[PDB]
Design a protein around this ligand. Structure first.
Ligand code: NA
Ligand code: NA
Length: 327
DNA sequence: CATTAGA
DNA sequence: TCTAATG
């Protein structure tokens, strides 16, 4: 957590590189496992040698460990950090819609900057065109103070269209957080569950609501169960307009909400931890359900859930307010 | 890890 | 169809 820190950070750096700039999935994978196991090790790595005794700890990495050990740096590291191409990749990527493959392709074409991107919006797809267009706003945080004003409008039209809907704004937001990166709305309806053959319109109804009022401004992706978009709080009585925000609304079988909700609400550690417990408590948790464990090794059969409580009850735990779902 | 664009 | 990008 700190005694192995540099090694881990170097190593990760190392990894992320291969992965993006290069297409070295393996080396990349190689770095991460090492990064992983070195991270667990309970003592101070005093040399590649010692490190080397590890699993996944090859000669190539052990080598890198000495160089970092001996001199507070690493060339390859330094050389990469410098590399204008590589850098270019890492940057283009911040564009929403641009990922490794497109980064590399763009670079090769010579587009290495934000401006380059503009000059060639045509070589860009609708997702990326938007990612472009709100480059700033998308990197900006979301003040809870806004999360509250957004959430408020959202539940308002949800309810407006049909009183039967159930929306929940999951995430850290939900976990009390001072700010958030984007809003996650988990949606559900009774008239939609596990079997009941969809009702695409269920999703489409609301998206169209939000839009009709202007909360929705753009569509990154709209599928029959997951709409991915852009939204903005009405810019008041002037002088202050609102930054464009990333929103994600998703349909859910009324039969799977709470688990999903429970889940997406994290924290990643709270979940992991609760989940690990359900195992002892003879259970199985996962994004959509909770099944009872059968000694044969495994088992099935989705116990019924009506609230975040059921799932609690089931594993016989203390209901944890989302507030304290930190870990 | 599953859903969507796109070509 | 596959392949990429988000979460
Ligand atoms: Na080894
Ligand atoms: Na990106």
């Amino acid at each position: 957590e700190t005694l192995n820190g540099g090694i881990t950070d170097m190593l990760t750096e190392l990894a992320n590189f291969e992965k993006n700039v290069s297409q070295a999935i393996h080396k990349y994978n190689a770095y991460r496992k090492a990064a992983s196991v070195i991270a667990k090790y309970p003592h101070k790595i005093k040399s590649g040698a010692e490190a080397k005794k590890l699993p996944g700890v090859g000669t190539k990495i052990a080598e890198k460990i000495d160089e970092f050990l001996a001199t507070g740096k690493l060339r390859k590291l330094e050389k990469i950090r410098q590399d204008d191409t590589s850098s270019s990749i890492n940057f283009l990527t911040r564009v929403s819609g641009i990922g490794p493959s497109a980064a590399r392709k763009f670079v090769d074409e010579g587009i290495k900057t934000l401006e380059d991107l503009r000059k060639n919006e045509d070589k860009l797809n609708h997702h990326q065109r938007i990612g472009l267009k709100y480059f700033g706003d998308f990197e900006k945080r979301i003040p809870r103070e806004e999360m509250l004003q957004m959430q408020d409008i959202v539940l308002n039209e949800v309810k407006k269209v049909d009183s039967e809907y159930i929306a929940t704004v999951c995430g850290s937001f939900r976990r009390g957080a001072e700010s958030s990166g984007d809003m996650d709305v988990l949606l559900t309806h009774p008239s939609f569950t596990s079997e009941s053959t969809k009702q695409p319109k269920l999703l489409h109804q609301v998206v169209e609501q939000l839009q009709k009022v202007h909360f929705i401004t753009d569509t990154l992706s709209k599928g029959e169960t997951k709409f991915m978009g852009v939204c903005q709080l009405p810019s008041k009585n002037d002088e202050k307009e609102y930054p464009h925000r990333r929103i994600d609304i998703r349909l859910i079988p009324k039969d799977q909400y709470y688990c999903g909700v429970l889940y997406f609400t994290g924290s990643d550690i709270f979940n992991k931890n609760m989940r690990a417990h359900a195992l002892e408590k003879g259970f199985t948790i996962n994004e959509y359900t909770i099944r009872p464990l059968g000694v044969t090794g495994v088992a099935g059969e989705p116990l019924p859930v009506d609230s975040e409580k059921d799932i609690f009850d089931y594993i016989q735990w203390k209901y944890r307010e989302p507030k304290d779902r930190s870990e």
